[PDB]
Design a protein around this nucleic acid. Structure first.
Length: 232
RNA sequence: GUAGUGCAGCGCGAAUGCGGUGGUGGAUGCACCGAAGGCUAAAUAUGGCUGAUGACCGAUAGCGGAUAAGUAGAGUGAUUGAAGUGUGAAAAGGAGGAUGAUGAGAAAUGAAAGUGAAUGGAGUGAAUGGGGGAUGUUCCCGCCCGUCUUGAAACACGGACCAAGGAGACGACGGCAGGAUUGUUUUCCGAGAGGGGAGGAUGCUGCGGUCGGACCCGAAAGAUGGUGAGCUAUGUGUGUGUUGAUUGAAGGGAUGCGAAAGUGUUCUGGAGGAUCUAAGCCGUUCUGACGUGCAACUCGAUGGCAUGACAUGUGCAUAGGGGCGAAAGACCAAACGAACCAUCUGGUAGCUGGUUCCCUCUGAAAUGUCUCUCAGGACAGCGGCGACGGGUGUAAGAUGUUGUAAAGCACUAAUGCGCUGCGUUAAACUUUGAAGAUGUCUUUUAAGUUGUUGCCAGUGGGCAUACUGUGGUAA
RNA sequence: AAAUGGAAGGGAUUGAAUUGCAUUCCGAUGCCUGCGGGGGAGUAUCUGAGUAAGGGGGCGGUAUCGUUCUGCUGAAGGUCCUGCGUGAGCGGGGGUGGAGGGGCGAUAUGUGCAGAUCUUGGUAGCAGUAACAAGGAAAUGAUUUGCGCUGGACGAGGGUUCCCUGUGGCAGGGGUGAAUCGACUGUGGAUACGGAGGUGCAUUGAUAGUUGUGUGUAUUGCGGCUGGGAGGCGACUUGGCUGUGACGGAUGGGGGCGGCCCUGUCCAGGAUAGCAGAACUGGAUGUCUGCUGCGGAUUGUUAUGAUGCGAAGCAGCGAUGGGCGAGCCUGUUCCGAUGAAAAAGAGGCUGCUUUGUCGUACCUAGACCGCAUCUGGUGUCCACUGUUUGCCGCGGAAGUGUUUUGUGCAAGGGCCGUAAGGGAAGUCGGCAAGAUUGAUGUGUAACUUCGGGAGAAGGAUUGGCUCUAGCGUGCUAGAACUGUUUGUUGUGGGGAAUCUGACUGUUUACUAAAAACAUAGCUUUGUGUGUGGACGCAAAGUGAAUUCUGCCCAGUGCACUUUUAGUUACGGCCUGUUGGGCUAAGCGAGUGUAAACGGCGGGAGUAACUAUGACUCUCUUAAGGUAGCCAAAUGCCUCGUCAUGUAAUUAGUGACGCGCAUGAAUGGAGCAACGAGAUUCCCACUGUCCCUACGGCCUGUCUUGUGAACCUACAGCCAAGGGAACGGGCUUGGGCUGAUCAGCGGGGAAAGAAGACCCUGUUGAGCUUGACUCUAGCAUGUGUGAAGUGCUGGGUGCCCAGUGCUUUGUGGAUGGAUGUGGGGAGUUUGGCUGGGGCGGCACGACUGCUAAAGACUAACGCAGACGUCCUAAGGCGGGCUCAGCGGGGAAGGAAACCACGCGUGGAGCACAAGGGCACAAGCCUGCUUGAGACUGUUCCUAUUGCGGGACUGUUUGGGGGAAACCCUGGCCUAGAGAUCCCAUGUCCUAUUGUGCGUGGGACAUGGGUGACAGAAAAGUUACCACAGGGAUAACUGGCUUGUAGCAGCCGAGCGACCAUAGCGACGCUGCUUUUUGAUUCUUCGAUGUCGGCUCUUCCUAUCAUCGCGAAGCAGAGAUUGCGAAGUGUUGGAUUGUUCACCCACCAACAGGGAACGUGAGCUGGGUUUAGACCGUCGUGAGACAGGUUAGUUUUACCCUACUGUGUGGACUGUGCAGCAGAUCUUGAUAGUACGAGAGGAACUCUUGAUUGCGACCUCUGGUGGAGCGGCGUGCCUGCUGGCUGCUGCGGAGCUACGUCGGGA
């Protein structure tokens, strides 16, 4: 055989990468006052980015829905509750939506940083200083009560409300983001390139669930380690 | 190196009257030696350079290269790579022709294939050859060689013509034959334990055997080390190109209807992978032209697309079991279901083709056994060349063996009648039974006049016919 | 009774082809006899063919040593003539040549050529041929005139090709000048992006943003002088700093560099027969985007608007002749796309001074690449005018390129034009051509995703001239007049249905553009972190919307769990004499999952005529195909059945459904819109055809110049025969024509290419997996690594598990073990065989027959059997008689048991068949383990192993029997396994000495190779390769004739009677070569493989026409037979078809052969390698004589054949060869003969035609680049007159659709 498409698309990307800018906020224990100086678009992202200026430091963060240029926000551990306002996660009531939550007290942000997402604060277990939160995927996770966050949802709304509708729109999206476009189906190739192969009719020819444990790398194509298949 | 012969990774890790070794793992005597630091001439190997030699080659030979040869030339590149010697002793001199001069000589020699001029003979028959005769012919005979084949003049293959070159030689080890010199030659049997007297050696020439490029020329492939994205494919940086029309979305104005909710008409505006046309780009049909071309993909007419998921110059990134692909196994410098260059490499070939002087003496086989054996091989059979050595491929007299042809019903198996006879059968039936074959004795029957052994080749696709079977409607 | 004209060998022959004879004769390289030569032989002689193969004796090339000679008074080599030798070869003479050359003996070898699609060099025929060139002219040609269209600059590439002089292309000498052009400088990149600096005029033979010059701008350095504030309410003015570089597509409005057009005036130019209100040409002149103060509510656009967060207006600041637009100014809009980076800031007025290095000539295609002076390819910029929406098409300028003594046109080609009447009858198929076409009124359906369909369809108008109306001044609307009726001198064919893909897009550079690929939408899976943080990132399937997406978890796969089986490795620990316990993942098990891979049944009865089966029983599955759809691109049978379209329907559409083998994201149903996709029909239109004609230009034909190639054993007329079974040459017959030129495609099984199909080889490679043997990676225990401490749990004080803490090692790794692993590597996948494959085993082995009276003897010949079985079914002693028949005996029968008289085996003996056997080899019965331990000779059986039998000997040996005697398995012929390795027994043994809980050997048995003298082994190729094979298939020929076709003989019956008018059973005998088989002789270094179209010839077994018989022949119409091959034998619908089947006509619509006639004659529908779809089959790569769609047709100029032509008068004779007309019809005969009637003929006379053949142009039709006319576009200034385009008529000539012409 020859080497399959999955493995070559991985090698092309170490030669010529897609790069995003790494948003994060700094450490400031005393309550300061910031200044949104600009909100801007970025290639390969869907969310707009805000430029906020402190007394001796500037930062780039995901803008929340409800920000505007020239607005003042506060940073510090004991800061008041309002859209924006980087503050510590024990000063936040239950049922409130936050974004860009860190996990180690000083790493910037880790959770909920894409277009239109947030995490939920569910419980404050005041003994042991633990906070249960819900992250965007649904998993529940206890963090310390000293990690910081941002109040509100990320801007950029529901981007899937509008269909792509046309070939050229999927062409411009994959140029900016790096998806495989177009995709030739594996059953339409010759056997030399794909485990799905030739044959006098187009058909896979054997089970499409494959293992995730113990088999050769380059055999893991299809539905890898699937617990269940079917419509519902 | 046979149960480490030597070396290495990982882990464990010594001794001080002590340590190591002794062709089978371990023990114990006796023998013999001192590792884990260092240096050391000579006798041995070998491209090239310089001297000296030769039963070596003599211009298609010998090094690729006897000369302005690793040159001229070819390839993007790594790489690749020829052909060509001669006036004379002396320039004493020529170089369109003619007339001349110099010289020993117009000047190295100068074959065949093929041609021009003159002159002799013949012809309207393909030509050419042999016998017999004659300054061409008249009569007789005569199809084109080489090769594979049961079988070729073949509608089987190679061969237009001429010259030169062109294929069983050499090394090692063994045997035999012929020949040369010398001769006071021999470590035996047996797994072992045990037992125990019986003419060659060293050269020379030839032939048969094996391994060597191995009689000469020939694959599809495999591996080691290198070159390419100037063609073409995808990504990315920076530039450039695109005429004139058609249709008429949202938004906005005015005007009519109606109790209201609402709705009619018409202007303005200029959307959309919306419709043509141009600069231009492709490649549907004519199955048009052309088809030793204008051309290793072109030309004419017709048709399709022309704001894009476009077209195009240039910087950078991706390389061969790898890349790149809106996917055709497509494309990667005129060959891609694995590129190109050099080496290993004179790669192997049970298969096809070729294999060079005369006369003379003998002269086959196309069958049996074993074979991943069936287009091959070995052993045996048939043949050649020997050498040494003395004494029946036909009949007659006697005496044995046989179960076919024909015939028959005694056994086995069949087959009609008449109520003891008449009728019909046989490769796997036989009570009988030939012609023909086949054993032994006697040359103390006729007629005639071989034994022992050495070294070796080719052959193992057959076919026809008289008589005689088997299968088949038959050939 | 057979297909080119032909064979007792020919002419012929009445016996010169019949039969019987011998008293004559002819006839070999054989025989006898005399000489000559070779080889044997024991020396008075005898004996000679020969492939593969072997032996003896000779001839020749080049050298050495070792001897012996010759050449300038002319060597070798070469050429002609001549002697000797059976031959290989060796001598002499005359020319030429100008320096060396030999004999004899031994010895060393790169030692002798006709061939190898041999190597290198030279040369023929073809052939003065193919191909290419000959560009418009004027005696001259710096002058006059005719035609074509690229023309001018920068880069890549080239490198002196550029200028002058001399010369017939060379030779000699010249020419490239930079602050203000590019680069040397920026950025991870650069001659196009960023960036200190300019414009005119003149100048050389050749350079110029570079030389010279008028004016400007920047810069290097060096000076001199001078200022840190004035104004304005404000916007802002001034020597008075911290700004820029720096950024996408589409589209409206305003305004324009240059160019072009219209117009007033002035100065000039060129042509003119005549006329022209005074033409034609050139030149020169002819304001508000914004901001501030006052003001205090309205105001504007082509469009969206602006405004108490301050409108209009007034006053300022700042910026900057008429008409058709490039940069520029100012708006709106589009994106899950939002449109680089770095170098480079300071500044007033003046004077002197500086400015480095390298490139610069010439060429856009005849100066580049494609081997070239090649119709191909090659980045950027500029370029006038009439007509027009158009920078297109159809015509003109500017600039640029170009010659001046070949012919005038046969046939056949390449590219075009016009055609009576018909109108797709042509063809696989409307292929090709014709037809529609611009603009403006009118009028527009089904359906539909409401947007579309739509330029639907269908109808009408159009020039020129002279005016009117509107306002925006060039467009729009209206009217009169006029012509030989006509005006776009350009620009879509349309309509009704079915299959299929949603749509715009992409693809096999060089045979496939598609239904294939992509696509939005829909669904499933994994993943909490990569610079990226789940509206993310990655992997698969299906393919817009609408409506739907059923049932199956038994098999395979995937997931989770093993906190309630089993199985399992290194190391460690435990216990013990070298064993056993404890400590993984995985496998196994349990549960879940089909938008995972996939699957989705038989049989019996049953409703008041039949028929069917709602209903029932029954077998059975993991579950038994649901909703829908169909002879559909999916249905074998099959051209299914019914309806509809036609004169006629293997086509199309509608309907039906037990569907070989339909069916649900393997996606099912479904067609709005779109398509150079596949199909069928309608209108229109036509040279597609009936059936061809005439014309144009370039070729060809003829001349001069330049001048190839392929191919070539030798050659080139036929019939038959035989032959390797289709001859140019051989045997027996028949023949044109003495040497030319143009044509042409029958033959040379023509050329090209070591057959790609098929088989064989112990030859490959691409790809697959449930082949064999392995392997990267990954999983999971475990060894190494860093010190100190606490904690909970196991067993017996113990070892270990997790385990938190402390800081003072570190996280980078590294050794071995078990599991997994077509992701990857290497390799294999027998043979025989009436081709191979599938099947069978004739592959080891036993019996009978085939087998021809000793033994041996073949076939995928015939009929069977073998891989076992038995403690007796082995050994021995004794006693008995078997199958069956006859006469008897209570219940007793066809068969029970007793018993007498006979019984040659007619029964038994493990199993196949054959042989054998009676006080036995059979049956019953007693005792036993000879089915013992060793050892030698021989047969099948040989050149030979294993195996299976026979016969002896030796035993401090058995069993049976009184004993003689027998016994080493089975009554005899089948039941069978090497080398190497391992297991057990007996006898020996390890070389420095001795042992051994460690090994080695000899001999004998067992463990097994059935392909049985004995490898360790799965598939596929239509993507394919190489060595061969006519030892072997798929087409033609040849032999054969079962089958196929056509005929005879007999006489049982039939025929109202009557075997034969006509028929003819049951049986029997032939012929042909048109069917399909059987075979494998020719061809695999190639003989182009189906049908049609076109064209010629032959056969007869006669369909019609001519002649003539029979009758169950009255006439009419037919039926059956003989002579006879001269002439005829058609037009259409459906299918690729051959074939078939229907319609119409006809005198009739017969059957066959010629390499299944005919592809350098065509066509290419069938078949048809490489793309693709469906059904069934396979885990898969793939398969199917199952269906469907898309898919290169090369070369004659040679010889012969054939057609003409040439090969030297006039008038004729006579031999040979060719050979043509055929068929139908009107009237009369005649309503007659014949007949009860109904019906209904003939000879002779007569009228017209159809088709073939040969001519002709008076008439009619076609053509007519001859000629005359009409209407246009551009150009000559307009009129006149020309040239160019479209159109009507159209003589001569040619032609058919027109006219003429057949023996007594």
């Amino acid at each position: 055989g020859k080497i399959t498409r999955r493995t070559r698309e991985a090698k092309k990307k170490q030669r010529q990468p897609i790069v995003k800018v790494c948003l994060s906020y700094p450490i400031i224990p005393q309550v300061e006052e910031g200044e949104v100086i600009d909100i801007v678009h970025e290639r390969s992202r869907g969310a707009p980015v805000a430029i906020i200026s402190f007394k001796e430091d500037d930062c780039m963060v995901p803008a929340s829905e409800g920000m505007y240029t020239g607005q003042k926000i506060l940073i510090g551990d004991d800061a008041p509750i309002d859209i924006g306002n980087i503050t510590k996660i024990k000063n936040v009531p239950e049922g409130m939506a936050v974004n860009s939550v860190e996990s180690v007290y000083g790493d910037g942000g880790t959770f909920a940083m894409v277009n239109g997402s947030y995490s939920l604060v569910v419980n404050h277990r005041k003994e042991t200083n633990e906070t249960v939160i819900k992250i965007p995927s649904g998993k529940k996770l206890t963090v310390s009560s000293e990690c910081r966050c941002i109040v509100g949802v990320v801007a950029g709304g529901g981007i899937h409300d509008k269909p792509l509708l046309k070939a050229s729109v999927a062409h411009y999206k994959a140029k900016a983001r790096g998806h495989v476009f177009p995709r030739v189906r594996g059953v339409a190739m010759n056997p030399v390139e794909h485990i799905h192969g030739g044959g006098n009719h187009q058909h896979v020819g054997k089970p499409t669930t494959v293992s995730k444990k113990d088999i050769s790398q380059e055999q893991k194509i299809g539905l890898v380690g699937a617990r269940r298949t079917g419509y519902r």
